[PDB]
Amino acid sequence: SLYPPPPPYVKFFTQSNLEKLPKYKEKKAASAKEEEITCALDYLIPPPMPKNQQYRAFGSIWQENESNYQYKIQELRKLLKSLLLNYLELIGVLSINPDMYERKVENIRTILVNIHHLLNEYRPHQSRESLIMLLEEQLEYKRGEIREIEQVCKQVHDKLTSIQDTLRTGS
Amino acid sequence: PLPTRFEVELEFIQSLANIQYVTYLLTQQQIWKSPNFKNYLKYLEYWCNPPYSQCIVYPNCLFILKLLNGFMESALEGLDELPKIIQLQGPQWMNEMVERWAN
Amino acid sequence: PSYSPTSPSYSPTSPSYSPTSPSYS
Amino acid sequence: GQALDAVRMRLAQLTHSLRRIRDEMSKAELPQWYTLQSQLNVTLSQLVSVTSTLQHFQETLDSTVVYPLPKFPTTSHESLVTTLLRKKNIPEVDEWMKYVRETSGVTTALLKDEEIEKLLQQDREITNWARTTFRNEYGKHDFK
Amino acid sequence: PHEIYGSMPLEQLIPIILRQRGPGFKFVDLNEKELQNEIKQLGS
Amino acid sequence: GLILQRLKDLNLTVSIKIALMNIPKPLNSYHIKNGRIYFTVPNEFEIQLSTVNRQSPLFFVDLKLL
Amino acid sequence: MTDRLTQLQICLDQMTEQFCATLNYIDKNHGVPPEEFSNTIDELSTDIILKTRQINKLIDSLPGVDVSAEEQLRKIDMLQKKLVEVEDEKIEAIKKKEKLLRHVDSLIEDFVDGIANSKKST
Amino acid sequence: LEILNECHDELKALPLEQVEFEKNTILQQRSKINSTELLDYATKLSKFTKIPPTFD
Prior knowledge:
The structure is cut from a larger assembly and holds eight protein chains of eight kinds.
Chain B: H1 5-15, H2 19-27, H3 29-33, H4 35-43, H5 60-70, H6 82-101
Chain D: H1 2-25, H2 33-56, H3 58-63, H4 74-84, H5 91-104, H6 115-140
Chain H: H1 2-13, H2 17-32, H3 35-49
Family (chain F): Belongs to the Mediator complex subunit 14 family.
Protein name (chain F): Mediator of RNA polymerase II transcription subunit 14
Subcellular location (chain F): Nucleus
């Protein structure tokens, strides 16, 4: 069908199984002093984390104070200059002998791809740095809130003192 | 190879986020009538803590199951209103999820 | 003429019961 | 179109009567019993007329082929189209139907000329006999 | 929990108190001695 | 939970409002309590009043017969 | 505000689109009068040069682009520290502000009572 | 007296204890969770939450 059937073990655990789970796990721990399914109550025991700390799904694999970059900058500048130079040479190829133009085209793309690889390694280095730009925005917002609070209560205190002087003069 | 129970339970949890899946599951009488399914739903509650929460793909179901948790003391009745209510309350529920995680 | 028209009694909240099954190829 | 037009007007008046009985039941205070009986009988006999007229013009309704308008936009009104163009019973009617099949033992796709046919013939005769018996009983005593 | 109570203006607190105390009981019928009374019971 | 200081502010507002108006001598017997003001004319009545705002006029709250 | 990263991605997408449009114009126009074609291409090349210079002035302006992320990490840590002390200081500031506001409420009440019992004294 | 009364009211409008519990909750919530898992989860949601302009 369109919707896959519920998992099979779901139907094994009634309320009686839930209430008898404590004594079952106590007995299992006493006896113990891929997990084989010898009893229907085994699944409620929390599954163990794999030792490899890896998870595979759909053909893909998955697994501290925040809680030479100049070399990478100059490499990206020279790569951009070389990319412009290669674009000029490739368009010249199109001008004179376009029949073999593709021979350079993908080459240029490789450089673009290498710039994209630098810009990929650069993500775990920008994504966390978003929390930094957030840091200064809430910090400056709270400083503005604080400063307008001592300002307003100081101007209230000044008004009170002026009133006190006015009433003392009228005495 | 045969996937482990981790993979199937995680995929079930992430598929629970679909409104069509929830409507289909609640359409059948014996799914809600059987206490086994709700017992499994309450068993699934323990994934809201790390490091299990780091393995989720769509955080919305995190509330949905919790919302489904509410369904055991709110009633089946209300099944018809489920798509409308999720569409209407998506903004504030997304905001509260962001407050729970992004802050 | 027409004494009174009918009040709109639409029920969009009705969930419908369309059976879906031939999805797998 | 004439048959569907009559179907339309009669269904419209039936819906009007339903709206009536609705807005006189929605009041916090229940009216007198007799008014409720009158409304019930009128609306229910009107439903009977609806059923009979629907039964009369089955051929005109069957001949008609449903097609959406060229001017009607489905991109924006697909929900409205799918509200109207789906027609399954409420589940409590289909499970009632299944419970009625199970309780009666009736099932109508394999029946053939053996025991059920001799039972079918042996049922006709009780009805005719009872009708004749009650005609005789009515004739026995002068009711005029 | 108290940050909602302590951040709403009185114009919205009054209907909240009215609905909490039910119909008929006005928002001003509460007695200060009575108030510290139920405060004492709820503090236990 | 702000109820105590809201009632105190209501009592203060009622007191200043009745200070605004020249109360009659037969109404000199007044009491202030729980955001309410009590005027008890013996063998006549006991009227309890309050106000919502300093600019808003007083409104009837409660009455008791003596 | 818009993030330096998002602007850099918009800029490189616009640069790619500009190159695609320029080469499309070259491919579909080679053969238009030579003077108009040359003028349009000069405009396109000026656009290329300008896009290149915004690229250069944006990639060197990522804040801390030449700063190693670990001193980014001590500065962040000490930022949360001094933050902890600044909300602490705000907690004493607001508590003593409430204390003076309560002192102000008490003298208001005393003065109001004095007015009331003075104007009803006679 | 009137004007100082509205000064008192507006000062009371700006917040006491509720703000300090909220700041506390922020501090233990931040201390409990490590930044590595948060950054990994943010990177993994960057593709899903952020709708690309080229997704037809």
